[PDB]
């Protein structure tokens, strides 16, 4: 079925004339606009007092990256490599070596801030959980060069952030 | 309504490439071999073109790798080496081409494990 | 002369004589799936991956080892081959560890590629895996035998390339392992080749841990230089 | 067919093939295939001289009258002879129908415009020789489209670089935007992807 | 467990530090050198033994779905310990 | 916190004066706010 | 053991939602 | 809303709607930001019989399309595409605005 | 008499009939000039054919539209409009003539 | 007859003018070309899909749904009835969005501010149904080629209600404000007047359409997921000027509000993507305890799931029009070619005729009315 | 045989005045192509840039490749005239940032290993 938006004819008997008319005399249908502004300014405005309130949030946002540790300390990652495989950036850059004692390790672990476009894929991808995306938003910079993450900054925000984090995955991990 | 004219087909001047990624480059028309990691064939079907492997350095930087070359990433697929070759001539790049290698059928008999005489039998399996 | 005439999917195609269903496969352009034949090695038979119909054959046959036959019809994609390629990828998958973010071998693994092309999408093994302790064979070749599948690639490509017969195979049944029983390392000048060979992550290059993964390697077609073999 | 896969619709194909069967009776001169897909999508391949013709007919005749034009696009492949295929995409609303109309060229064989015919064809063409480099004779005014003012090439083409071959910085020296050849700090990582063991039997090519 | 390398920096956990005569040391100055202070390989290594009296254990990380891919370990080999391939954890049998 | 007010306005901070080396009485900002609070004032869970 | 839980509409649906233009005449000839 | 009566008076009035009805403004009406665990059911391939994947292989059913009239190698009643779109009915909810 | 067909710049067609006729007519005329052989002659002959006694037998314009399957008569006569000049210049390119040439060997060929 | 360049969403104009009069009008584009195209083919299909998010930022869901579709086709596979339950939803809260973003923005540049702040409030909140549902407030890449990636939070379906039975209040506070006001009305009314014989000549789709009284909608005509079984209409203009299509776009978020409704009262249980793990990852404790399972992600991440070869074009009734996909896949995991339509190209491409033979700031008006987002155009 | 569809000229003598067209334009174009962009360049080396440009592809011996060459070097033109192009573009004709490369075999071999 379809919807005429513009199939109304006017009356032309005397009244409806005379209605017309004073609506084009007597501007009552911009009076009707003044009146629609006068009451919004009489209702409780929407703004919410930023930096100390915040906006809603949920535990599926994604912020800045992390990388997360096994509570013994050990860390997640064993350099799979499946986060650079499907970073649709190539933001992701990864080295990797046996540690001294053997274990599978990355020695290199870099993200680009300025290529990632946030997506999410990597810790999807993650098959440890290893690299999140975490729930900070306010780490802006006065440099280019402080967006260009390595090991030791990812791995430093993971043990600042790893409280929420880990409270985030609990209340989102039986979704994925 | 035709010209008819005799002349090999040459589209240098129209494609836009800087005079030093035609003259000084050399690409590689092949059939790409088997990675021996896998028994799997499906990757040695097609006729690929590349070019030749330029400098490539550390960024002082994150140590990342970086580039110079704008066909270091540069791969074609072509049906044919026939196919292949008219392209690069078309596209006035010197070439090199190298014949397609096919492994060779082989006398496989499992009986042969088992042999009287000869030293085919197997000590185990 | 002595060629007979064989069907694949109702395509006559022309072999000789001792020619297996898996050759003449192979001439009309078809692969069929295999974990334990190689064409350089003696004909094992034991992964039963390659198992394919005949028509009107009631019984799937072994395509690397079964000597084709005149007048045979090979159906290489019928209902009944491609189960028995979905229940053989099941067996082999079911005792297999969860080990592919950490073995070396996961972009570059026929278990897995075999596994998506031809086996099923899901599991209903609901019992615990077996493991088995790792061999030491030296420092060339890093031993992870419970990725091992027991194909016998090594094993046949010792005794008959390598002329070493060291590697074998112990016990019985599910716990039957391949090794050598003795602390021995397997040394030869061509030792490093059973690293190709091996399908899985079993027997992986040692110096080459961890260090990348293939989709990431740049392929440059060369020449060796390390002898006069060229 | 379980509730995984895509239900089939066996009286559109019968239609498509109808119509298809009909428009090749009728253009003998310039239809050299006609083609179905297995998802009900039907495909003319026409010699380039029946573009005018066609398109015409396609728009014009009492039972097709595809009067909006969808799209039109080309395609790069570099092993054909003919590398550029030219591809219109036309839909009838008096039938609720959509067909694909495909053509060749090469490098220098001229193609007619279409905009005679729709005139949503003036910009789409414009586009293509700005990507692709076929040019369309006796177009109203050709010319670049969504390139840079004087780039060089044309990206779309399969052997034009992913990153080009200038890049823009600020030159404070001459105090203005200036192009040099292009330097990565990061090169693009080329992943090769593609695995052996095919996928798909019933698209095996024969092994000549 | 950071250390420090003869000119004065903290070698990270991937032992990486600047030689003497390197220049871009200089990107440090006025600034800092990011390091993570905890080094996985000594805190995995303070992770007692698990006393296992059972051949073949399963280990997953711990947390149930939140660890690792579940993979079973054997520990027949009495010189060594099992070690878990994504985790680090230890477990072996009760010898005597 | 106060529920009566519309949701965004009903749950706030007030900065410390003096966080780790910095005078904030004026210089305030969101980042000063610890894990555990920003998942509580940014209403990722109901539970401080 | 347990049952299934996911988002889901409540029981007899939900109420009804206006969709319709309300512009009314505020009245003066 | 913390609104005064009088002031609730003078915007209705002035919008000509009833403003307390709908608000704009989100209050308790809302969902909890902490919300029980959910279980998420399985599709329809969790069965543990009878479901070899080869019988819901969407990907292998996909085949070349079908040729008619290649080139290379009775009444005749004409035909068209598809058959005549029939048009619409109009709206016996609202037919004008 | 309706007014407003609704599509913007389609007039009303006051005494529709007579002008539906004599475009059928005139289709009819040209296609006389193609070769009686022509797959497009005998198929557009047959569907003027039908229009033309379709709209001999009614006298009802909203029968007649109904009966058309085209709908607003005025967008009927534009087809017929469209179809003349559709003939006309179909007269002119002689499109049922043999194929110009066959593409070259895999012109067509996907995949590669 | 002077020559002015309105230089630098982001537009350039060149227009000669005689007088008042418009004389000709010229626009010049790729100012966002960023070449995604070409982008797209060293990408799979999976990496390719949050491109389409960025096509036509004010409506990514919509996008998404749109590819995922083409891919779903190319696939011989369908997605799970409670994932196109889903899609349909969400895209009609799209549609508010875009509609609201278009609305308001066309009284903005009109000169009436007060609206856009009014409906961006309502823009803020859908913000949060976007984030609530996937993690991000506007690039979204939620809508995937085998159903959706997450299942809606286990109160969100209640929130949406709430929004909704609000909404209406909403739209009837900015008719209010525009549509029997006689300054936007003198604004609107007979201006880039398109007959319906140009309109389907020059390409246009959508409302452009519409507004010329052409009876044609892709969810009427050609549905796609779970369109037939909602109930709704069509709005059709009369003159084909920009008050038409400004009535037109204020029904269809009214049409948009009914169909949300629909879709909340029937919404069925089941999964969200499709049961096939060659297309869809698994979930992920069967990735940690299945061995098959395992395979399939890596796999799935990695080299991605092949596409068997062919080509499709696939259309749906986006919010700005006809937005279509032609995708040519060669058999591997990379598409051979992506060609993306937009329908603001097209309206583009036809501003020139629509703005013969009127003033200087009604070119702004009819811009304004064609719905023009510069990133699906430059793409 | 050989036989090809023609662009715009049928042989070369027709391309050649074509080509001869263009040249007279993009000649007479200069000096208010400097005056308009305020060109710190002169107008001997513009026309001198003009001539080297089509000195670059005079070994063109096909003329649809020569007609197409004409076709973009008018849409050059085109650019040019209608003030499409800033002056960046018209510079970029210069290469005044680059640093000049040396083209004898011992600076390349100095400099690294590029042929
Ligand atoms: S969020 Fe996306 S773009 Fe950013 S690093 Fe992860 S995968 Fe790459
Ligand atoms: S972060 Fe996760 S996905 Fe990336 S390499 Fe480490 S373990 Fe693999
Ligand atoms: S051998 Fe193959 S299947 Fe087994 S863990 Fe390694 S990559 Fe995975
Ligand atoms: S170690 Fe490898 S090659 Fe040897 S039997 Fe096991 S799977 Fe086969
Ligand atoms: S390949 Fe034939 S049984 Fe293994
Ligand atoms: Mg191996
Ligand atoms: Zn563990």
Redesign the interface.
């Known amino acids: 079925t379809y919807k005429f938006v513009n199939m109304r004819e006017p009356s032309m008997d005397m009244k409806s004339v005379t209605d017309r008319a004073a609506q084009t005399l007597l501007w009552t249908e911009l009076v009707r606009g003044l009146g629609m502004t006068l009451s919004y300014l009489f209702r409780?405005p929407?703004t919410?007092?930023?930096?100390?309130?915040?906006?809603?949030?949920?535990?599926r946002?994604r912020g800045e990256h992390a990388l997360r540790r096994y509570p013994s300390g050990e860390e997640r990652c064993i350099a799979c490599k499946l986060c650079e495989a499907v970073c649709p950036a190539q933001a992701i850059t990864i080295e990797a070596e046996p540690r001294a004692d053997g274990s599978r390790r990355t020695t290199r672990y870099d993200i680009d801030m300025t290529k990632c476009i946030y997506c999410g894929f990597c810790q999807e991808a993650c098959p440890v959980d290893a690299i999140v995306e975490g729930?900070?938003f306010?780490?802006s910079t006065e440099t280019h060069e402080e967006l260009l993450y390595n090991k030791e900054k990812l791995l430093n925000n993971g043990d600042?952030?790893?409280?929420?984090?880990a409270?985030?995955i609990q209340?989102d991990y039986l979704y994925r | 309504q035709l010209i008819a004219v005799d002349e090999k087909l040459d589209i240098t001047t129209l494609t836009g490439v800087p005079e030093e990624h035609i003259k000084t480059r050399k690409v590689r028309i092949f059939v790409p071999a088997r990675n021996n990691m896998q028994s799997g064939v499906n990757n040695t079907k097609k006729w690929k073109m590349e070019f030749d492997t330029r400098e490539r350095w550390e960024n002082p930087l994150m140590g990342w790798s970086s580039t110079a070359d704008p066909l270091s990433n540069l791969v074609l697929t072509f049906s044919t080496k026939e196919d292949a070759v008219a392209f690069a001539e078309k596209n006035g790049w010197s070439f090199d081409v190298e014949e397609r290698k096919v492994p060779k059928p082989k006398s496989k008999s499992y009986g042969a494990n088992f042999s009287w005489n000869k030293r085919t039998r197997v000590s185990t399996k | 002369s002595n060629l007979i005439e064989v069907f694949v999917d109702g395509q006559s195609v022309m072999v000789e004589p001792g020619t297996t269903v898996l050759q003449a496969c192979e001439k009309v352009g078809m692969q069929i799936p295999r974990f334990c034949y190689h064409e350089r090695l003696s004909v094992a038979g034991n992964c039963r991956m390659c198992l394919v119909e005949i028509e009107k054959a009631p019984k799937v046959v072994a395509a690397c080892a079964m000597p084709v036959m005149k007048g045979w019809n090979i159906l290489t994609n019928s209902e009944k081959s491609k189960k028995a390629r979905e229940g053989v990828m099941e067996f082999l998958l079911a005792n297999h560890p969860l080990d592919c973010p950490i073995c070396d071998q996961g972009g570059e693994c026929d278990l897995q590629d075999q596994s998506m092309m031809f086996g099923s999408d899901r599991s209903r093994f609901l019992e615990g895996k077996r493991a088995v302790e790792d061999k030491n064979i030296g420092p060339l070749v890093k031993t992870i035998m419970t990725r091992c599948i027991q194909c016998t690639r090594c094993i046949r490509f010792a005794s008959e390339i390598a002329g070493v017969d060291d590697l074998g195979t112990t016990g019985r049944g599910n716990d039957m392992q391949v090794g050598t029983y003795i602390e021995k390392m397997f040394m030869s000048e061509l030792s490093g080749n059973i690293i190709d060979i091996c399908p899985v992550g079993a027997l992986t290059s040692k110096p080459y841990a961890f260090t990348a993964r293939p989709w990431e390697t740049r392929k440059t077609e060369s020449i060796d230089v390390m002898d006069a073999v060229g | 067919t379980r509730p995984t896969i895509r239900p089939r619709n066996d009286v559109v194909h019968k239609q498509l093939s109808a119509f298809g069967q009909y428009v090749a009776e009728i253009l003998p001169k310039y239809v050299q295939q006609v083609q179905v897909s297995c998802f009900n999508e039907l495909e003319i391949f026409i010699h380039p001289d029946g573009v005018i013709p066609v398109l015409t007919f396609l728009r014009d005749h009492t039972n097709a009258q595809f009067k909006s034009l969808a799209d039109l696009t080309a395609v790069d492949v570099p092993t054909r002879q003919n590398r550029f295929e030219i591809v219109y995409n036309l839909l009838s609303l008096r039938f609720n129908s959509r067909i694909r109309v495909k053509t060749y060229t090469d490098e220098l064989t001229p193609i007619e415009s279409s905009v005679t015919v729709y005139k949503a064809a003036n910009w789409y063409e414009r586009e293509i020789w700005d990507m692709f480099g076929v040019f369309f004779a006796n177009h109203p005014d050709l010319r670049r489209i969504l390139t840079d003012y004087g780039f060089e090439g044309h990206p779309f083409r399969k052997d034009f670089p992913l990153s080009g071959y200038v890049e823009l910085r600020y030159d404070d020296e001459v105090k203005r935007v200036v192009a040099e050849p292009v330097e990565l700090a990061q090169e693009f990582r080329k992943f090769d992807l593609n695995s052996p063991w095919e996928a798909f039997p019933a698209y095996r090519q024969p092994p000549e | 467990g950071v250390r420090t390398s003869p000119t004065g920096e903290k070698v990270t956990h991937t032992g990486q530090a600047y030689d003497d005569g390197d220049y871009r040391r200089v990107r440090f100055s006025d600034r800092q050198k990011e390091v993570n202070e905890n080094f996985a390989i000594d805190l995995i290594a303070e992770q007692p033994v698990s006393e296992v009296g059972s051949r073949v254990i399963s280990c997953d990380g711990g947390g149930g779905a939140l660890g690792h891919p579940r993979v079973y370990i054997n520990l027949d080999k009495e010189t060594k310990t099992g070690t878990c391939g994504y985790c680090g954890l230890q477990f072996r049998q009760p010898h005597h | 916190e106060d529920?009566?007010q519309?949701?965004?306005?009903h749950?706030?901070?007030?900065?410390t004066t003096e966080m780790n080396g910095r005078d904030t009485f004026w210089d305030?900002?969101?980042?000063m706010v610890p894990?555990?609070w920003?998942?509580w004032?940014?209403?990722?869970?109901?539970?401080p | 053991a347990s049952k299934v839980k996911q988002d889901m509409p409540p029981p007899g649906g939900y109420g009804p939602i206006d969709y319709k233009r309300n512009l009314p005449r505020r009245g003066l000839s | 809303?913390?609104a005064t009566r009088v002031i609730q008076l003078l915007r209705n009035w002035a919008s000509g709607r009833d403003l307390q009805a709908k608000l704009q403004?989100?209050?308790?009406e809302?969902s909890?930001?902490?919300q029980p665990p959910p279980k998420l059911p399985v599709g329809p391939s969790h069965k543990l019989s009878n479901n070899y994947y080869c019988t819901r292989d969407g990907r292998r059913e996909a085949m070349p399309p079908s040729i008619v009239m290649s080139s290379q190698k009775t009444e005749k009643k004409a035909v068209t595409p598809a058959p005549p779109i029939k048009r619409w009915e109009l709206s016996k909810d609202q037919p004008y605005l | 008499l309706k007014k407003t067909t609704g599509l913007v710049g389609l007039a009303v067609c006051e005494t529709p009939h007579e002008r539906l006729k004599i475009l059928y007519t005139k289709i009819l005329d040209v296609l006389g000039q193609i070769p009686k052989n022509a797959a497009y002659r005998k198929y557009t002959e047959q569907i003027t054919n039908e229009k033309l006694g379709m709209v001999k037998a009614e006298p009802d314009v909203k029968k007649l539209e109904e009966q058309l399957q085209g709908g607003q008569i005025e967008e009927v006569i534009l087809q017929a409009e469209n179809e003349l000049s559709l003939a006309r210049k179909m007269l002119r390119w002689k499109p049922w003539e043999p194929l110009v040439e066959e593409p070259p060997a895999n012109q067509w060929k996907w995949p590669i | 007859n002077l020559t002015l360049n309105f230089g630098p969403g982001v537009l350039r104009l060149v227009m000669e003018l005689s007088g008042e009069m418009v004389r000709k009008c010229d626009p010049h584009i790729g100012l966002l070309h960023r070449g995604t195209e070409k982008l797209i083919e060293y990408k799979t299909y999976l990496q390719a899909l949050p491109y389409f998010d960025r096509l036509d930022y004010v409506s990514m869901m919509c996008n998404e749904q749109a590819y995922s579709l083409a891919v779903e086709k190319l696939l011989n596979i369908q997605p799970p009835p409670r994932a196109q339950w889903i899609r349909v939803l969400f895209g009609e809260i799209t549609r508010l969005l875009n509609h609201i973003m278009a609305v308001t923005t066309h009284a903005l540049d009109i000169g009436a501010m007060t609206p856009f702040f009014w409906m961006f409030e309502e823009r803020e909140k859908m913000f949060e149904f976007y984030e609530r549902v996937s993690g991000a407030r506007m690039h979204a890449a939620y809508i995937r080629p085998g159903g959706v990636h997450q299942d809606l939070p286990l109160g969100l379906l209640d929130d949406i209600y709430e929004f909704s039975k609000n909404f209406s209040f909403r739209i009837d506070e900015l008719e209010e404000m525009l549509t029997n006001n006689r300054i936007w009305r003198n604004r609107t009314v007979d201006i880039g007047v398109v007959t319906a014989e140009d309109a389907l000549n020059y390409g246009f789709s959508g409302v452009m359409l519409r507004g010329s009284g052409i009876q044609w909608d892709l969810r009427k005509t050609q549905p796609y997921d779970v369109y037939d079984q909602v109930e709704f209409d069509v709005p059709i203009g009369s003159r084909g000027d920009c008050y038409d299509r400004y009535l037109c776009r204020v029904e269809e978020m009214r049409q948009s509000l009914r169909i949300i409704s629909q879709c909340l009262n029937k919404m069925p249980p089941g999964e969200i993507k499709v049961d096939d793990a060659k297309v869809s990852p698994p979930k992920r404790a069967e990735m940690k305890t299945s061995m098959e399972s395992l395979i399939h992600h890596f796999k799935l991440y990695t080299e991605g799931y092949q596409v068997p070869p062919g080509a499709t074009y696939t259309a749906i009734e986006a919010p700005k029009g006809e937005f279509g996909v032609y995708l040519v896949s060669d058999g591997s995991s990379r598409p051979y070619r992506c060609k993306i339509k937009a329908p603001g190209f097209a309206h583009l491409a036809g501003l020139d005729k629509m703005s013969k033979g009127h003033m200087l700031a009604d070119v702004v008006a009819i811009i304004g009315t064609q719905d023009i987002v510069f990133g699906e155009v430059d793409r | 045989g050989t036989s090809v569809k023609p662009i715009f000229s049928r042989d070369m003598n027709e391309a050649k005045r074509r080509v001869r067209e263009l040249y007279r334009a993009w000649y007479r174009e200069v000096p208010n192509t400097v005056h308009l962009f305020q060109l710190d360049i002169s107008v001997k080396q513009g026309r001198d840039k003009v001539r080297e440009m089509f000195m670059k592809n005079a070994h063109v011996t096909d003329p649809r490749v020569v007609d197409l060459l004409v076709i973009k070097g008018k849409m050059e033109l085109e650019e040019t005239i209608n003030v499409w192009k800033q002056r960046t573009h018209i510079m970029r004709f210069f290469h005044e940032t680059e640093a000049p490369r040396p083209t004898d075999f011992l600076s390349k071999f100095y400099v690294g290993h590029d042929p």
């Open positions: 409780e929407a919410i007092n930023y930096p100390f309130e915040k906006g809603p949030l949920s535990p946002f729930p900070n306010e780490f600042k952030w790893e409280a929420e984090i409270a985030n209340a | 529920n009566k519309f949701f965004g306005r749950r706030w901070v007030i900065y305030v900002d969101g980042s894990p555990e920003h998942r004032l940014h209403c990722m869970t109901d539970d | 809303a913390s403004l989100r209050y308790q809302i909890k930001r902490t």
